[PDB]
Each structure stands twice: as C-alpha cells, then as structure tokens.
Symmetry: D2
Subunit: 205 residues, 4 copies
Amino acid sequence: ITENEKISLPKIDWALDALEPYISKEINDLHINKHHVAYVNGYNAAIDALEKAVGKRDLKSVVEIQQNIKFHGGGHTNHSLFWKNLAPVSKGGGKHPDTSSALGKQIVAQYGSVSNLIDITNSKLAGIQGSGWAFIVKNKQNGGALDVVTTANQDTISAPHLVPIIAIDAWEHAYYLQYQNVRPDYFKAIWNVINWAEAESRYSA
Amino acid sequence: ITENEKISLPKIDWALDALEPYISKEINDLHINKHHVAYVNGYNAAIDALEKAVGKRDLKSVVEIQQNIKFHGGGHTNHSLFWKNLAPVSKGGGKHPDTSSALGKQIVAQYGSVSNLIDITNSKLAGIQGSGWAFIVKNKQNGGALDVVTTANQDTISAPHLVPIIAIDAWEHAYYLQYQNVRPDYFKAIWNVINWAEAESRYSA
Amino acid sequence: ITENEKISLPKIDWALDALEPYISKEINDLHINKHHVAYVNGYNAAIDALEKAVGKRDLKSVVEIQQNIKFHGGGHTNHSLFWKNLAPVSKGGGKHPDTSSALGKQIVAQYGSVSNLIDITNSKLAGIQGSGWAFIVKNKQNGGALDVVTTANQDTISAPHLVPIIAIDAWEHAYYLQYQNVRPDYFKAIWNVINWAEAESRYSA
Amino acid sequence: ITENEKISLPKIDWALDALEPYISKEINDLHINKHHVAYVNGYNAAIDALEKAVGKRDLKSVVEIQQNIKFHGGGHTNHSLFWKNLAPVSKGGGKHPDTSSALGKQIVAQYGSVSNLIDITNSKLAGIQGSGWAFIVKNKQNGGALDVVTTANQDTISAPHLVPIIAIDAWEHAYYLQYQNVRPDYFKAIWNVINWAEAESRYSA
Ligand SMILES: [Mn+2]
Ligand SMILES: [Mn+2]
Ligand SMILES: [Mn+2]
Ligand SMILES: [Mn+2]
C-alpha cells in the first residue's frame, strides 16, 4: 500500500456536543473516533491485502477481499457524507434549502415542499430492517430528478449517474445511547441538524 | 387472522439481572420487552396483511409482505432460541457440555475441544458485517456434523435438514449499552452465560 | 388453498410466431408453456404449503416458504407484464409512444427522446449479472418521475408507490435458443416488438 | 495492470465433443470460448480499472468496481474448477471415487455412499433460484467434514477454511441448448462425466 492510496479520518466542521439535544456528544465521539476510524483502518488494510493477492493471481483471496473493500470503503464514504450534511442550529442546521436554488427548485417541483420530502424519507428510514442508510439522491440521466433510496449496511450510492444529496445513518450505533429502541424519535429529531446548504452544493456540483 | 396462528412473547427462565455482569439487566429489559415484542407484533400484523392479499390475488402486495414475514418470523425464532441458550451461572450457564453426550462426543471428534469451537464461532462473529447472527448447527444428512454459519438481520436456520444448536445475537442492540463499539468483548463475554444443557438437548431431539 | 386464491396462466394477445424475427416461436413456446407455467404451479403449491405451516404456527417452515412465494409470485407478475408489453409489428409493436400522452410527455421532459430512454435501458440490461429484469418505472411520490431499475431473478416492482411501465426479461432462457451468448443483440432487437400503447395505459392508470 | 496480474483461459484436458451425449459439443464450445473468455477479459479489465481508481482514492469508483472483480474473478475460478472436474468416460468420467482414498472414506463415513451424496447435491441444484452453482466442500476446521452448498451467479467458495471438491454449473447457458427448460435432466446426466479422481486430489491437497 502506497501513501497516496491511503485514506484518513476527515476533519469535522462542528464540535462533538454541538448537535445536542438531537445527537449527543457521547454518540458523536464514538461514531467518529471509534466507528469511522474502524472503516479508515479496514479500508487501508483491505487495499494492502488486495495488492498482495492480485499480484500473485490468488483469485480466491482477491474475491474474498472485495467484500472488505466494499464495506470499509463504503463506511468511509457514507460517514464522510454524513458529517458534512450535519450542522449545529447556530451554523444553519435545520434551515430548509433556498427555494430558488437548483435543489430547492427541484424539491418544490417534484414534492411540493421540503416537509413532504422529509416525510417520504422518514418513511423509507422506518422501513429499513437491520443496518443501513437512507439517501436523497439526484439522477443525472433523467433530468436531475430526485428520489429517496435505502442501502443495507455500508452499501452506498456508487452508480456514476447518481449523486448522494443527503445521507442519513440508520445503524443502531447512530442513536442507541440516546434513543434506545425508539428509532422513529431519532429519525424525526435529526432533521433539526441537517445541513441543507451542503445538500444544495451537492446538487449543483 | 385466527387465534391459533398468532405468536406470543415466550417466558424467559431467568430474571432480567441474572446474566450480570456479562449481560446487563438494562440490555435484557429492552431486548425482551421492546425488541422481541416488536417481532411478535410485526409477524402477527404481516400474517393478517398476507391472508387478505392472498385472498384478493394481489400478488404485488403478497410479494411485498413476504419480506415482513421473513424478518419478523425470523426475529421471533432467533430471539426465542437465544433466551433458551442463555443461563445464569448458578443454573449451569457457561458450563461445558458433557463430553459423553451426543453433542459432546461430536464436538470432541470434530473440534477436539469446546474452547476451539468457541474460538471458531468468535471469529465468525467478528466477521459479521452489519446486523446478524452466528449459529452452531447440526446437519442431519451428513452424519450429524456440526458447523458454524452466520445469517444477516433476522435470517434464521430454516432449512429442514439443519438444526440450530447455539444462536448468538450480533445486532448492536444486543451489546451497545454495555460494551459500546467493542463487539469482540461482548462475543468473549457471552460464553460465560451460554446454556450448553439446552444445546445438548437440541442435538439429541 | 381455495379456488379464489389460485393463479392461472394468462391468455396471450399474439400468436407464438408473431414476434419473429426478433423473438422466435421456439423461445416463446417454452417461455410461456414451460417457464411461466412453472411459476403458476410454484405459487399455488407455495400458498398451499404456507396456510398449512401458518396454521400450525411452524415459524421455521413459514420462513422457508416465503422465498418460494417471492420467487413464483414474482415470476408470474414479471412474465404477465412481459407478454402485455410485447406486440407484433402489425399490432403496434415497436411504435414509439404518442408524445402528447402523459407517458410520452414525461419521456420528452426527462430524457428528450424514446431513443435516449431505450439507450439508458439497454445500458442497465447490459450490466445485469446472472438472471434478472430491467423496468421503466413511474414513481407516484416524486411527481410521477420515470426511472430505469433492475431486479435480480424473479424480484419485481412491488413498492406500492412504484408502477412497472415496461418489463424486459434478461434471463438466459429469454434469448439463448436464438442469440446464444450474444445478449446485447437480443436487447437491441426486442425494442422492435415493445408495446408502447400498453406502457401509456400503465402510466395513466 | 502488469503481466503477472493478468489471468488466461485454461487448457481443457478433453475435446469439445468428449463429454457427449451428456454435454454437447455446441454447449462446450460456447461455454469455454464465449462464456469463460468473457470472465477472463472482464477480470483483467476490472483489475486495471481498480488500480487506477485506488491510485486516485476515488472510493465511489473503487466500491463500484469491486462487484466486477467478484463476478469475473468468481466466473473464472468456478469455470476452471468445472472443466477440471469433468472427464470423458474413457478417461474415468463417472467412475466413483476409491473408497480407500481420504475423500472416499469421508463420503462413506458421512453419507454411506456416493449415490446418496449425489441425491443430496441434485436436490440442492434443483432448489437453485436463478443463476448459480452447487459445490461439494471440505471444511478444514471441523475434521475435514464434507457439505453441499450453493452460491448465486459467480459467487464461489472463497473462505480460506473451505475447499471446493466438486463444482456444478447451474446457469441456464450450461444446459439450455441441449436440455432446454428441463434442468433436472441435466443435473442427473452430469454425474456420468464427473471426474472423481480430481475431487480425491482436491480433498488430499
Ligand atoms: Mn454509522
Ligand atoms: Mn436481538
Ligand atoms: Mn423469463
Ligand atoms: Mn457457466
């Protein structure tokens, strides 16, 4: 594994206790410093393992390692999107996107309001069985149309023609210390710290 | 939905705090009374929705409902197996199976010792990505041979030729409040409260 | 299993040899009379097995049978959609949808042309690994937006908010006798017998 | 991509028509020269795309490429195992393994006879939904115990502790031209040309 190929834990634009009372410092410290750090390490080790196996044409090891690449690679990708679409109330968290922005105009055209889109997303999040994510996505092929999708585990939006706009973590570790089994309460509460300014930038990028 | 079709939460043969210090009373209370209760209700609701859709030949609904049958039905089966293979130390929890038993003799012949089987099982548990279970299984068609398998979410040992001997819950709700992100500490801890008398009885049935 | 819950092979609105030179009579005869027939039988048997097991509250059998419900129920639904969106050239097969119809207006707004939408679908069909389908779908929640999706095996469009508009069978049995390994030639060829009038009715329904 | 990393189509130890009347020369010709060639080319293309994406830390592409590595790498491993465990009758195809061999002794001890194991394998094959494989496997951690498992599409026996002994292709391209929809006729016929000498050698390795 070379220095240019290795990934690192991203710097987070807000303090660990800044999402309170919606997401605790206790969850954020473990989520970033233990959970995200595990995917950073897992990806860098999986890449090192893969180059060694590929070089030897060990197709049995190559095949086995692919799953760890997908998982740790996806975990890093999902969590990085997550931290960037979260913001304290003081820093624009929970402020709806500007209705004149490309994203704001698209939400209005397809859903009528951000309120309805959030209801549709909370609905997808409730239906997730096990570990997974919900994403608000832009499709670059069908006129920049928005849709809400879910992925299992650390699976991500990897289709070249699709753009992740908002990423919501539904893994039990994302809410358990504060909400316990009451997953719908976390889903309802998170929107108060959602960074829609980042979502607008992602759409127009 | 007829009454004889409806499932119920089982009686657990130990107090909420009886598996301490290995599994907290806080975890068991939520695990039994919130988590397992949700699988009981979900299954009964899915069977009712299924019968209506099957009666109307509404195959689009039928196909959608089958996922909730699988998830909730599996959730009930898995947690029921789990409580039955958990026991307080004073009630034989953690006590290794009699080497003279059908299960005991099979463990010795295949793995040499219970400790080696536990080592294998803990490695399979460590490898679980996202929500899932590990099972020690008996295969009825290959000479009652044991193996260690894992399932995702609430998938269970449903094949008629396979018998679940030990079920270990690897979902984050099974350990998070006590062990947080340190899932290997939980997998190591659990064996101290595993009911091998139940596993011996499952092998012989 | 009752008489009202039983599914049957649908009547086909075209002669077996009427899709030639695009799809042969030889494929069509096996496709309808052996393949679709096997899903009709599989579903009716799975339903009979399900009522027996649900009644006995045999969660292990109930869980096992769900897979057969999904598969044969999906196979019947997918094939029924398929025959309805196929038509001889003499009966409107290959005729692009009317641009003033709700579907035609949506295609123009989102993709610019039917040809561009066909190119996107052919790209999705090319990327299917193993057995599966491609569908042009309408989403009732995001403003009636169209999208191209794939499913594996006999998985279908079962989400209540989604409508299958066009179903394209990519299983090897759908083309093998005529095209052999040359799967892209079949994908290119099938559009000449696609019934877009059925697609228009499905969108407006 | 470097030379040492590139895979090649293997030499097949029997003529295209050598397995007749069990597997036609038309099937073998396409299976080796079109189907397996597509896996060889696809894997080499995926390794090249992977190295470029890994080099520029483009994790979105990396995560997307992993599936093509798994599919093509698995496709090459599976077909290579397949040709090696196929033999013309005049070269010992269909001849049961020596009961004195390590494999032979293991079959007798677990299944009683090769015919009972074949029956078990044929039932697992019949149960495959869509594209997949059945494998007779040796587990190196539970006493070298044999079992029968199935994989979907081009998924393979990649776990380090498991050894594939016999691989059977259940994709429609493996039998369609000759057996059409009657897949059980193919599963029955294949055992007449299975190379058990290779299976014994795999077990002992
Ligand atoms: Mn997370
Ligand atoms: Mn649980
Ligand atoms: Mn078909
Ligand atoms: Mn093949």
